[PDB]
Amino acid sequence: SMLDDAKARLRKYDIGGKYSHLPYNKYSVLLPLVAKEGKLHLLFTVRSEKLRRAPGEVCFPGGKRDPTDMDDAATALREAQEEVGLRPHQVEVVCCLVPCLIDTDTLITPFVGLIDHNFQAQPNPAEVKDVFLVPLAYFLHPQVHDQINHIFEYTNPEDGVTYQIKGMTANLAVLVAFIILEKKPT
Numbered sequence: 168s169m170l171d172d173a174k175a176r177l178r179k180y181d182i183g184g185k186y187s188h189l190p191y192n193k194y195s196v197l198l199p200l201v202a203k204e205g206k207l208h209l210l211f212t213v214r215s216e217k218l219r220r221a222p223g224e225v226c227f228p229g230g231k232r233d234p235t236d237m238d239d240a241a242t243a244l245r246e247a248q249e250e251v252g253l254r255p256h257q258v259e260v261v262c263c264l265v266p267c268l269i270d271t272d273t274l275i276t277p278f279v280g281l282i283d284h285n286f287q288a289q290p291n292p293a294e295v296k297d298v299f300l301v302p303l304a305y306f307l308h309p310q311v312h313d314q315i316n317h318i319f320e321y322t323n324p325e326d327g328v329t330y331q332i333k334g335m336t337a338n339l340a341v342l343v344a345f346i347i348l349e350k351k352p353t
């Protein structure tokens with residue numbers, strides 16, 4: 168099946184807890200996969216304009232590890248719940264992808280999660296201005312704009328709204344699309 172095939176592909180790239188004890192400032196993100204209309208999608212947030220870091224930017228749910236978290240996956244799930252109302256029973260964490268090093272002292276660990284089909288996002292407006300889906304296949308043929316760094320522009324056909332996706336968030340989206348969609352019979 169589509170979902171069994173996606174999880175099987177993802178597991179091959181799982182680094183697990185290999186880098187998780189290193190003494191960094193630690194953040195986790197959840198890359199949330201949603202199956203709709205017979206295709207996989209990624210769920211993104213638009214950060215509230217109120218926030219200190221990166222107001223109004225597109226990013227995956229996530230945040231800084233805190234002492235309550237049993238592990239890095241728990242960080243991702245806790246933050247996703249706070250930001251978009253995703254409950255732990257509504258997500259199956261499939262793997263941990265390559266972590267992202269930033270600022271010399273920070274490690275961001277991405278987890279891919281399969282999201283229940285009955286989840287409906289409840290954006291927490293103190294943190295999130297918007298939540299939207301992009302089909303995973305978009306990231307194989309994105310609409311690229313150079314600002315010199317590459318920015319993806321995605322227009323939602325349901326409403327005509329255009330979102331800009333860039334940086335780590337864009338990079339991770341492409342990685343997940345490659346992992347799941349490469350080398351597939353039609």
Ligand SMILES: O=C(Cc1ccc(F)cc1F)Nc1cccnc1
Pocket residue numbers: 194195196212213214215226227228229230231250275294295
């Ligand atoms: O903050 C994140 C994830 C993240 C992205 C880059 C980063 F460097 C660290 C991180 F935790 N996600 C979020 C937070 C608040 C509202 N909507 C999304």
Ligand SMILES: O=C(Cc1ccc(F)cc1F)Nc1cccnc1
Pocket residue numbers: 201286287288298299300323325326
């Ligand atoms: O789908 C959306 C936003 C949206 C809803 C209708 C629409 F017409 C356009 C849109 F961008 N959000 C979401 C939330 C939870 C799970 N899966 C998708």
